[PDB]
């Protein structure tokens, strides 16, 4: 018997492209998954997909190892999922988040968002349980 916390943090940075008129690309936006500081999340993340809008070259975005980030020019905000997967040999295996990457429309001063996530892990295996505690996770009883 125990719960193991984690804490994700999902972000993101937008900001007007300086291009020629005749590139489309209007914006740079950067997604990024992390640990809080002095968290190391790569003990309990096996990798971090970033599923981008179906328009983008290779759509599908695996970063195996930190950063877990994407950096891309684009003309439109969408809805990213976000998989992280755990190094978990038993249920839960990886967690989907839904991600809402908007962009500075208007001229708008540059974006920079933060999303927190907390990871609750019920009764983990001893093994994936270090991992946890080792990436800066908390024990509750
Ligand atoms: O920006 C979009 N599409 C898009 C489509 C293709 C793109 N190629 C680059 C540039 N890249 C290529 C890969 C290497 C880094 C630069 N950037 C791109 C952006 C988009 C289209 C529809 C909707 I609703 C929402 C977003």
Not at 70 to 90: C, D, L, R
Request: aromatic share 12%; hydrophobic share 35%.
């Amino acid at each position: 018997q125990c719960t193991v916390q984690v804490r994700l943090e999902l972000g993101h940075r937008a900001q007007l492209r300086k291009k020629p008129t005749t590139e489309g690309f209007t914006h740079d936006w950067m997604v990024f998954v992390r640990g809080p500081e002095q968290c190391d999340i790569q003990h309990f993340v096996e990798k971090v997909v970033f599923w981008l809008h179906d328009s983008f070259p290779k759509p599908r975005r695996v970063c195996k190892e930190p950063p877990y980030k994407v950096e891309e020019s684009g003309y439109a905000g969408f809805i990213m999922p976000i998989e992280v997967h755990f190094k978990n040999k038993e249920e839960p295996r990886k967690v989907c988040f839904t991600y809402d990457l908007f962009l500075n429309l208007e001229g708008n001063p540059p974006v920079n968002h933060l999303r927190c996530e907390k990871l609750t892990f019920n009764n983990p295996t001893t093994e994936f349980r270090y991992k946890l505690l080792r990436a800066g996770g908390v024990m509750v009883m």
